């Protein structure tokens, strides 16, 4: 139907579960995109819902630090998602490669992540799954935009509505309120931002334990610290921002707007 009529397929850029990503061109526009081609026949009822909600939620977001979903087409047994062409790979991969970021690079990175999160929150969306694996670099070039991706676990919220939206996310980045089965909302994204920022600076997470029971106990207790000597030379304002993000009471936790006005960021 409309995908074949408007888009021209080029080379494979990546593969997922029941999905291939190819470079494509909107023929009449002459602009290149990443076309995610999904075999809908292979998807479970659960997977179908997550595709539907991803297609709806990503499409209502428009921000330079969010991977833009330009189009969503359903044909005979194939779903097509047209995204921004992003060739820099995952923030996760860049952190593994570089080991850690300078305060200047960490601040620049988290600034772009908070702008993306602020946009989501203003548009009435909670991502629920912020992690370096779900953040992509626009290109290989230094200073290339960081873009938020994979809205498969994203929810719509009405203003400052708190509700039990279910147990969802990535263990290491899960907020205390989700672990506590509490009604939750926008703040869960800011906790994940704290975990990401911690990782950016020293290249290991504030909460890790092979024993998940211990891991979840530590998160709920806010039992993180700044080990020596790596943290000894990190500025107090950097640690202050992490502390305000890793606040176990989501009501007392710094917002995306507030975080962007923090001395260590100063973007708003």
């Amino acid at each position: 139907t409309r995908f074949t009529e408007e888009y021209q397929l080029f080379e494979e850029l990546g593969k997922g579960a029941f999905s291939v990503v190819r470079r494509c061109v909107k023929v009449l526009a002459g602009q290149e995109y990443a076309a995610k081609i999904i075999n809908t026949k292979k998807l479970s009822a659960r997977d179908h819902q997550k595709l539907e909600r991803e297609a709806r939620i990503c499409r209502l977001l428009k921000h330079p630090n969010i991977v833009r979903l330009h189009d969503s087409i359903s044909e005979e047994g194939h779903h097509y998602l047209i995204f921004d062409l992003v060739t820099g790979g995952e923030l996760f991969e860049d952190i593994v490669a570089r080991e850690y970021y300078s305060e200047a690079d960490a601040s620049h990175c988290i600034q772009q992540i908070l702008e993306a999160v602020l946009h989501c929150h203003q548009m009435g969306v909670v991502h629920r799954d912020l992690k370096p694996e779900n953040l992509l670099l626009a290109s290989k070039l230094k200073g290339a935009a960081v873009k938020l991706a994979d809205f498969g676990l994203a929810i719509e919220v009405e203003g400052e509505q708190q509700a039990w939206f279910g147990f969802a996310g990535t263990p290491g980045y899960l907020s205390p309120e989700v672990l506590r089965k509490d009604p939750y909302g926008k703040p869960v994204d800011l906790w994940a931002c704290g975990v990401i920022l911690y990782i950016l600076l020293v290249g290991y997470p504030p909460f890790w334990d092979e024993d998940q029971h211990r891991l979840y106990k530590q998160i709920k207790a806010g039992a993180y610290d700044f080990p020596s000597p790596e943290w000894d030379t990190v500025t107090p304002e950097a640690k202050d921002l992490i502390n305000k993000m890793l606040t176990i009471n989501p009501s007392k936790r710094i917002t995306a707007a507030e975080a962007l006005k923090h001395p260590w960021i100063s973007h708003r």
Partner: peptide
């Protein structure tokens, strides 16, 4: 620093 996977429900690991 290890890759971590997204869950849509609680599972005790």
């Amino acid at each position: 620093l290890r890759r971590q996977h997204s869950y849509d429900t609680f599972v005790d690991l």
